[PDB]
From a paper:
FluPol is a heterotrimer composed of PB1 (polymerase basic protein 1), PB2 (polymerase basic protein 2), and PA (polymerase acidic protein), which replicates and transcribes the viral RNA in the nucleus of infected host cells. Initiation of viral mRNA synthesis requires a direct association of FluPol with the host RNA polymerase II (RNAP II), in particular the repetitive C-terminal domain (CTD) of the major RNAP II subunit, to enable “cap-snatching” whereby 5’-capped oligomers derived from nascent RNAP II transcripts are pirated to prime viral transcription. FluPol binds specifically to S5 phosphorylated CTD (CTD pS5) and it was proposed that it targets RNAP II for cap-snatching in the paused elongation state, of which CTD pS5 is the hallmark modification. Structural studies revealed bipartite CTD binding sites on the FluPol of influenza A, B and C viruses (FluPolA, FluPolB and FluPolc) with notable differences from one type to another.
To overcome this limitation, we co-crystallised the four repeat pS5 peptide with influenza B/Memphis/13/2003 polymerase in a different P21 crystal form, previously used to obtain a structure with the 5’ end of the vRNA, and measured anisotropic diffraction data to a resolution of 2.42–2.95 Å. The resultant map, which contains two heterotrimers in the asymmetric unit, showed clear electron density in site 2B for both trimers, into which an unambiguous model for the CTD peptide could be built. No significant differences were observed between the two heterotrimers except for small displacements in the poorly defined endonuclease and cap-binding domains, nor in the mode of CTD binding to site 2B, although the density for one of the binding-sites was slightly better due to B-factor differences. Only very weak density for the CTD peptide is observed in site 1AB, perhaps because of competition with a phosphate bound at the position of the phosphoserine. Three repeats (designated repeats a, b and c) of the CTD peptide (i.e. Y1aS2aP3aT4apS5aP6aS7a-Y1bS2bP3bT4bpS5bP6bS7b-Y1cS2cP3cT4cpS5cP6c) are visible in site 2B in both structures, including two well-defined phosphoserines (in bold). The N-terminal part of the CTD peptide (Y1a-S2b) forms a compact structure comprising two successive proline turns stabilised by four intra-peptide hydrogen bonds, with P3a stacked on Y1b and P6a stacked on PA/Y597. The phosphate of pS5a forms a strong salt-bridge with PA R608 as well as hydrogen bonding with S7a. The rest of the CTD peptide (P3b-T4c) has an extended conformation and lies across the PB2 627-domain. To create the CTD binding surface requires concerted side chain reorientations of PB2 W553, M572 and W575, allowing P6b to pack on W553 and Y1c on M572 and L561, with its hydroxyl group hydrogen bonding to D571. PB2 K556 forms a salt bridge with pS5b.
Residue numbers in the entry:
A (entry chain G): 29 to 49
B (entry chain A): 88 to 137
C (entry chain A): 238 to 722
D (entry chain B): 1 to 754
E (entry chain C): 1 to 420, 431 to 482, 495 to 740
Write the structure that this text describes.
Amino acid sequence: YSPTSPSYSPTSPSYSPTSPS
Amino acid sequence: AWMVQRSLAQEHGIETPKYLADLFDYKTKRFIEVGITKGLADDYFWKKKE
Amino acid sequence: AIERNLARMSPLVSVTPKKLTWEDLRPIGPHIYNHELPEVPYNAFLLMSDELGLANMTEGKSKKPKTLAKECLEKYSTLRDQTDPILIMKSEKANENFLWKLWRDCVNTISNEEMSNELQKTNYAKWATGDGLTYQKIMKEVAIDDETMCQEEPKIPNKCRVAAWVQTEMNLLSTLTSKRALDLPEIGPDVAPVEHVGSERRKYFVNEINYCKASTVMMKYVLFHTSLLNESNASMGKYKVIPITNRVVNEKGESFDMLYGLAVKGQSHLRGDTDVVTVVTFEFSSTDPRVDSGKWPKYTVFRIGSLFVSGREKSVYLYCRVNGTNKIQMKWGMEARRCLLQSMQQMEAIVEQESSIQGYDMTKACFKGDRVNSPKTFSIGTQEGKLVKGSFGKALRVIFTKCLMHYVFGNAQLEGFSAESRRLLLLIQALKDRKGPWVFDLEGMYSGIEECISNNPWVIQSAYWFNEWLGFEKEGSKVLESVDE
Amino acid sequence: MNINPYFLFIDVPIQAAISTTFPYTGVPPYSHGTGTGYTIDTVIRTHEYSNKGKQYISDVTGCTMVDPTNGPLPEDNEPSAYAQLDCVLEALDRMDEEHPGLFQAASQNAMETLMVTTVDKLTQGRQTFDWTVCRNQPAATALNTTITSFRLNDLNGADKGGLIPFCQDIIDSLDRPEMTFFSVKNIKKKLPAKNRKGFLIKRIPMKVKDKITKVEYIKRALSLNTMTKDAERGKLKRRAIATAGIQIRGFVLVVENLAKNICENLEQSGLPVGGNEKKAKLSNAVAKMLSNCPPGGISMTVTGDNTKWNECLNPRIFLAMTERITRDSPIWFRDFCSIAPVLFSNKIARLGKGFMITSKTKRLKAQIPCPDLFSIPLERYNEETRAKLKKLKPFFNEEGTASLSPGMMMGMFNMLSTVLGVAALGIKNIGNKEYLWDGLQSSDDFALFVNAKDEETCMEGINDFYRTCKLLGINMSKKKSYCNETGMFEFTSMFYRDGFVSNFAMELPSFGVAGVNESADMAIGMTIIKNNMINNGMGPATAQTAIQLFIADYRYTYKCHRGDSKVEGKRMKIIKELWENTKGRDGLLVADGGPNIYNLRNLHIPEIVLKYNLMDPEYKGRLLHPQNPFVGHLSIEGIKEADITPAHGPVKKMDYDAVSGTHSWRTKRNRSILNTDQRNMILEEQCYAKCCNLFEACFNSASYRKPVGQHSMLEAMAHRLRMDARLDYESGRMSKDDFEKAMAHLGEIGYIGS
Amino acid sequence: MTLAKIELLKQLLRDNEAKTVLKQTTVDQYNIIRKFNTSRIEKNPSLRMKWAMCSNFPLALTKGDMANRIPLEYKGIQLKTNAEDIGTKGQMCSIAAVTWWNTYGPIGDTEGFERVYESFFLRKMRLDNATWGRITFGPVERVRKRVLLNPLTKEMPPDEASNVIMEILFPKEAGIPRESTWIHRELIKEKREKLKGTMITPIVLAYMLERELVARRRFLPVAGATSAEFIEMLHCLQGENWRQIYHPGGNKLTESRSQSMIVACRKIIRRSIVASNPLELAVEIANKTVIDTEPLKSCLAAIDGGDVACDIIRAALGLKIRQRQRFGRLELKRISGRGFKNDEEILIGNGTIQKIGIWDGEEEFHVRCGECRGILKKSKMKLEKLLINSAKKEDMRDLIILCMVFSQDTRMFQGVRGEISPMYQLQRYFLNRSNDLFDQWGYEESPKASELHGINESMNASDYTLKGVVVTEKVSITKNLSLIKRTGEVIMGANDVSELESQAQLMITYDTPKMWEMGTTKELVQNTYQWVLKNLVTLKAQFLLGKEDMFQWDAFEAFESIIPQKMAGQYSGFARAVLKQMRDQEVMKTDQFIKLLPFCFSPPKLRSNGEPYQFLKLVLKGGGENFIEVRKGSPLFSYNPQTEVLTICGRMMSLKGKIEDEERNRSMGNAVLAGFLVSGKYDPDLGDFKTIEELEKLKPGEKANILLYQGKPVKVVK
RNA sequence: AGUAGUAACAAG
């Protein structure tokens, strides 16, 4: 995308909670 | 002395001697080294030949 | 030896450590609140917020200054032809007649069919220009023998108080207009993504400043000093009429030549860099000088007519003033564009930091906001004693104006004040950081600041602003003294 | 709503916005008229800080001499010059312990450099006081006028080539019973004028010979010229500065070279290090002291300023420093290093133009020169001057100069004064108290780091440091110095806040058109932008705007607007024609009304090189004409070097890359003085130039490599042309007739030179 | 030419002033009179130029035929000064004259121009043939290093370069013949042919030759691209807050690729070592790392050299490991043995104590020096055998000294006279002067065998030869990055890789979304804490629900790699405890939660008694400023509750709306020591503030005085 | 007058 477009920043590490079901 | 030596050598297409020559013969087109020794001429000759 | 001497050296030789507190930081230059003192008068080379330019469409070309002034005056013929003006204000030592005659000579010369912009050295021009006012240099022997000849006591900068107009200037100059005056030349086309980044940034940064009132005032100063320095070298012996002009561009991209008035360049045999050339300025304004008379003691003001401006007849005054400049001031005026770089650098650095955090160019986000990030705001001023926030662009436009004011009001008083008050700024920061600052001679530090507060309109207002901001910083510190107790 | 520019600091830390606090778009302060008022101030203050010392009369000059060294210890916090030799020697001894062999290493290197140093080295100085004309001239001019004048008194040590035999002549000249020298005196011709006074005085300066006595000469050789510092930033009031003669420069060079060797190896010296090397060094020193902080303790940084630095420092202390530093040195070199401090110990200040008295009634003004300063009653001076001259009296000399034994008005010992400052930093502790101090020192600027258990104990260390400095003649400013917990400080206008922050405003005036020529200025302008992007945090948006601003300034300065512009001008008229006549207009330089194609990526490429392949071969042929008449005799300095003047610091030379062309011109020398005919001075200049050009005609290497030899220029030129001729004839480049003419001419030259 | 000069000298010697100057001025004193200037020196050049450009004739004209080709005026515009205005000043011209010359002047010869200005034209082709990658917005830790500003044709000392230029331009004036002429014969010859036939002033040629022979090194802020070809684009490569990928045109040296290769491999191992299955991650990263434009695997396979780190990555990528070492002018390849380095303060024979690295173990090496090929055998601080082949005096002189210097024999260290990496400095010392080191060795007998012979200091065969002179790989790699032979013998490990963090000469890129994990300490710190701030809502919520899975969140693994291997586990023990304590005793502090959370990743290491280690500051890799403060703010991490601003490495982020109202009045004393809480206010009866030692040697139930920071004393109970 | 500011310029 364009540098000013927020989607120019790469997808960062995201903490996804865990559950056995 | 060096300017003369390098002018002469460069003109007559001869290697510039690493040391400063005493004379240059224009007929022969060769640099000359003069030696005044208080011993044997042959001893001084071969010692400066090295 | 060191411990020997240190043992016998007096306890009176001490660095006198004092742990700094907010209470110790009293307001700087308390005399600026003293109503006995005169309010600091306007002393700039040209008008700024009070300027009025007579607009005339450019046919694309950049015609001769005399021609463009002539053509502009032809379109506002009523103001040009006024020979019966009403004297509104007179400067103590100003000759109103001589000034008005000099204005008429300027108008008549600029409007005549000759290419020359030279004025005859008339009795009124000679007076206005300071003809033959340099003292005669006699021989040292005669001077020694002459008892009446003394080394004069030096003039000292007068002590003034806060003037409401210096705030007004800051307020109005940092404001957006519909016109652009910048004359920024071309650069090579972009290849590197970082080159494309700069160009997309300039669309926000440069356009914000270009549209603001201060830019147009700056360009007027830049272009006038440019012509004045050339006139000063090329025509040393001649009195010359120089138009005060600007090329402004509207929203659609239409060019207009602005005529802010006419100036008289006196004789200019400028040998030394500090040598003064008298410039007599005749500048148009809508501002009635009686509304804030404390601003205008240096000025002789005529009412020359009226213009229909917004469904209303608005009065047009001619501000006349004997001024002066030297080569240095003109050369720095010619370089005043650099006000852009100092402001742009400071604010771009924040965008670059913000981009570092978010992972994409935060220019648009900071200015106008985007779908992810709210627009970046700054504490901009005060209204009814309460702290008011404004935009990134406004903050940029404030710094840029401030940097223009550094040129417009720049001198040893501002140099000394800025240098000495910077220590106090860094100490305040130390208290704000909770880095426990200690001082050795606080009252000596204040002396060095306060001796620089005299008659510089910017220093006096900066001192006022410093104290205002200090008050709000002291109030904030009360939130920190509770932490971890 | 009322805008307050200080409200920025609510949202941004002061260090993070420190550039906005530098008003470097404003005009820097200039002085008007005389500097005598300021010079007399220095003479008085310098003596006020030493007056409790020993006062005596010099049996060489008859001057009033004050010696504060080993004087009584001060009993107040006023500037003290009462430095204790013992404490200085103990400070230097503790440095010698921490740096074993440094003093002998420094002395050896400095001595070996001196033995290799030639006299021409003295031409690399700036403005120098010329005792022959009692005015400031360039270093190379003052050197020449000294060498040539020295020949009139049988002093030919300069001819040997090395600095030492020239310096031998300088000290030996002080023994000459009389000195004959080449001076300048002007012939007055009264002409008519169209002004109040009715007439004119046209002066014609001419070279003369003048004779002065030994005492008169010694006084001149010991004399400093004084003027007011112009365009100095961050100061309300002006100050006096001083320029030394050419004689002392050789000795100062060696003492500063000695001090540089020491400074280089001192961990806490900010000199001679500069720019990014300094920043790294300071940043490392801050990181060390942070990590080496006692756990539970506190680290504190003094943002240090010294007051009356030059006024209080004493030549006698530097004399001791040179003595203690050159301990294990040959007596000759110890004696060599001793001379610069000794000449400074007996220095005399010239008091400038004097004061101007006026009649406001009669509109008359007159200059009262320094010799005649007391020719009028002091009631006729203003209160400030009346007070000054009364305090000057005891130090005043008949010929309008002042004795100035104490102080260092000229400076020139920046490195050696730094070594003295680092000596104080080196003490670290007094009386085994529960604190440690260290820091950085750049001349009169210092940062002191103090480690201790509490800030109360830290303050004890700062107080001990304060007191220790007084013993070396160093006075910490309590007014301008402040302290805080380590993390932020200021050092030589560089601002630290968990790292050094950018200060863009400091560099702002350097962005302008340099004023070398339109070629050099283009390279300089683009390089300044390039370097400020790298070093001073200038972003791409600002960098690009800088390119525009620079081109705007350049086009207006050199009157070289775009060929398609409708701008009036004599140059513009021909630019407009060149625009029409040219097919490849992309190839035209901005100076030839061409387009600007500079962007961030190509800032480092010379404009001619960028545009070369886009140029018309007729334009390219003209622009780069090998024998064009605008480029004169180019020196290796001429092409690469340019003096760039920062807002803050001494005027430094920077390198630029530019192709030599018709824009690489030079402005006529400033031989444009009102009612002055310079015909004699210009002829002298042209004579030296003729001789040097013809020498370069014979020796083409001279421009590049310094020619060596103690033999005559003529002897060298003749021998060269004789060989040129012979080998031109014996090769068949020269005709038999030309050879005979050449060898005949050379025969006449051979006679003239013997 | 010659006759013209002689005739002009005669004309000049007519002037008695010139005659005096020429006779009295020595050749030395030419250099003084060349700069002679009586004109008043300009103090304001920038002002003087703006002034002078408004005057009629500000420029100086060179008198000649070409000056005369300029007319007096053009279409009314006066070009040069009138003939009646010249005299005792000279002929001046207007700026319009230059314009006129560039418009209608003589067209001169430009042949050789591009060959004279080759240096500048290459600089342009490097940009013109360049490729630009992405620009990215993130933290850039720049280091100030001494770097080369511009690429060179062949780098020389100035004195050497000077002689070479003299031989090219002014041979007759070159003076005493120098040995450099023979060394640079192929350069001189080449330059003579290029600079043959050009009419440009020799001084310009000289300068432009000096530009491509004499180096310009300066201190500049760099970030992983140090080669001149990058340095000349440094302004576009990065700021503090952004990176621009740039591949310059032209060819790059193999030595540049080799140096970057090593930096890359060392970085991959440093990040891999901290992973569960380092070998897996090492392979994942190594495959996706690029040195400029060349893949890492390609460089390793192509270049016959490197270090431990390179071989480890080679073994991981399935390449044959080289055991090549380059000791300046000596090239060794391991035959047998294994050596480990132990830095100890050995006393050296000059009179100083330098920290030199002792290589333990018995090793055999395949030494090489042009003609010389030999097999070495060195033990701990000794040389035992050295079998070398017959070669030239010059080739043998190097190898024999190099072998005895690299072996680090105790005789070499106790034979230093005068003021001198420390080991490479000894190489360049004993190479220049060798007659000092041989005297501090000793001589022995020569073998009279069929192939064996001996040589002495005279570079020839003698019976007094130096002591010890004798003149005539299918590896596996473990999960933990150890190289094991079939016999179980480990010949290389991760712990054998250099700790030295240096700048790559070529720009290294990682074609992976994990590229941020390859950052430096300050880069990783900044990003890690940004990841925490980006996921703070879910991270904090899940932690308050009782779950502690966030402790071992992948995002924190890279962070661990810049925590010293010793303390990582101990820091985690403290961190996890302090965190759990905050939620378990309802004394939460979000700033402290954020600060310590990343330290919780490592497998916890508790004290012998089962309680966690207490800490004042958490020290990270790099300089003294690289630490976190538990109680205080640090250069890396600081929080201001006044404005709710969190400063991480200078970057300011707002915690506004991520703070509990009751949290602002909560003292940090509850989240400062593991198994401690705020009892009350400071109690003078309890004495001074307790150290970490005294706090660790406290029996549960006892109270103590703690100082959070200057002016915040608190009474804490266990 | 004015510029300016511890001392000048307002031609020589």
